[PDB]
Amino acid sequence: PRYLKGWLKDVVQLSLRRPSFRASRQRPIISLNERILEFNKRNITAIIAAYRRKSPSGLDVERDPIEYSKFMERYAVGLAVATEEKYFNGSYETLRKIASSVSIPILMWDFIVKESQIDDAYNLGADTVALIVKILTERELESLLEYARSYGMEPYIVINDENDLDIALRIGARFIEICSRDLETLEINKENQRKLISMIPSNVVKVAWGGISERNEIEELRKLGVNAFGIGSSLLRNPEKIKEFIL
Numbered sequence: 001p002r003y004l005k006g007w008l009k010d011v012v013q014l015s016l017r018r019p020s021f022r023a024s025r026q027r028p029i030i031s032l033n034e035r036i037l038e039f040n041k042r043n044i045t046a047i048i049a050a051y052r053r054k055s056p057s058g059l060d061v062e063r064d065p066i067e068y069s070k071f072m073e074r075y076a077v078g079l080a081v082a083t084e085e086k087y088f089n090g091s092y093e094t095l096r097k098i099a100s101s102v103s104i105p106i107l108m109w110d111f112i113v114k115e116s117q118i119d120d121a122y123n124l125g126a127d128t129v130a131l132i133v134k135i136l137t138e139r140e141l142e143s144l145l146e147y148a149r150s151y152g153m154e155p156y157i158v159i160n161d162e163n164d165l166d167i168a169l170r171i172g173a174r175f176i177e178i179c180s181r182d183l184e185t186l187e188i189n190k191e192n193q194r195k196l197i198s199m200i201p202s203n204v205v206k207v208a209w210g211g212i213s214e215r216n217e218i219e220e221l222r223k224l225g226v227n228a229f230g231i232g233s234s235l236l237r238n239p240e241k242i243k244e245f246i247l
Contacts, residue, residue: 032078035078049235066098174205
């Protein structure tokens with residue numbers, strides 16, 4: 001990984017020592033990026049609903065993950081499941097059970113630093129995996145993107161600033177999350193986010209994430225070329241608010 005500081009260095013050290021999941025996949029690959037594009041052509045708002053328990057950017061919610069996922073299966077374009085265990089209190093077993101319960105695409109939301117974590121996502125049932133530019137060297141980022149594509153997954157490349165974006169385009173990313181939340185400081189900057197969105201060519205599937213809470217800003221981001229919208233704490237507190245974001 002990169003030279004890191006603070007909690008990011010901590011979580012990366014944990015991910016490097018995380019044991020592998022050694023069972024066999026039991027569901028097909030359901031492409032999240034392909035389904036997003038299907039929603040765009042159908043003029044349906046594409047929203048990625050997240051499940052997590054703890055979070056550095058929010059108090060912990062204790063809700064049934066299976067009741068949650070089944071409800072979101074009716075409205076969401078995909079599900080993000082946080083599996084990091086220290087700062088998010090996530091679990092591989094939680095992802096396994098969600099993947100066994102729903103038939104919509106599932107994104108593994110974690111801090112991927114080694115290949116076996118991509119083995120884990122595949123065997124667990126995840127349809128794609130998040131790769132975070134700011135914690136990986138360019139070479140590591142490219143290897144893991146290429147490794148995940150060997151499974152038939154289209155990886156989900158997370159960017160924060162113009163450095164992350166330039167690198168993402170360099171290593172041939174086609175599925176980008178423009179995150180407004182800086183992971184080092186947890187501060188949100190939507191102006192920088194919209195600046196990065198304007199610089200991403202049209203052939204990339206773009207996901208806006210960070211502090212999204214209103215149908216209004218979803219329509220404004222859509223007019224800038226954003227294909228899908230990730231929403232976490234808002235939907236974790238009130239799942240039925242997704243009906244407002246889509247309708």
